């Protein structure tokens with residue numbers, strides 16, 4: 001719901017997630033080629049990462065907060081859909097999502 005919440009998502013939510021030790025694989029799109037993952041983009045049709053979210057927040061792409069929250073949803077959900085439970089990347093996405101939930105509770 002406009003600018004204040006979107007700035008809170010940039011300055012508080014994204015910043016806290018970005019600075020976490022577990023952030024680095026989510027800071028840029030999944031490079032399925034470098035990672036030797038032939039079926040990533042056969043399974044994942046809507047890729048999403050925090051680098052893209054950061055750019056969208058910085059260039060006023062979003063109409064409202066919820067559209068940004070959907071991008072965070074897509075990023076966490078893609079990871080859960082593609083990978084097995086117990087995979088390290090899933091545990092990292094789960095810990096980032098826990099931190100995301102702690103921050104979006106104080107959403108103005």
Ligand SMILES: Cc1nnn(C)c1-c1cnc2c3ccc(C(C)(C)O)c(F)c3n([C@H](c3ncccc3F)C3CCOCC3)c2c1
Pocket residue numbers: 025026030031035078079082083088089
């Ligand atoms: C998947 C997958 N599903 N959702 N996401 C977000 C990812 C994903 C995205 N980016 C990366 C990534 C980027 C660079 C490098 C190196 C090479 C260090 O520059 C990696 F290693 C990377 N790996 C590893 C990785 N995952 C799967 C297969 C091979 C592989 F290396 C993770 C192995 C477990 O600990 C964390 C990193 C990623 C996994």
Ligand SMILES: Cc1nnn(C)c1-c1cnc2c3ccc(C(C)(C)O)c(F)c3n([C@H](c3ncccc3F)C3CCOCC3)c2c1
Pocket residue numbers: 065066069070072073074076077097100101104
């Ligand atoms: C409640 C509640 N009462 N009725 N309904 C239907 C919901 C409801 C149901 N599903 C979701 C949901 C699913 C995944 C993810 C992530 C984590 C992105 O995958 C969410 F964020 C989600 N949130 C957020 C949310 N709501 C409340 C507390 C935490 C929280 F994150 C909304 C915050 C405002 O913008 C829209 C999403 C939901 C709220």
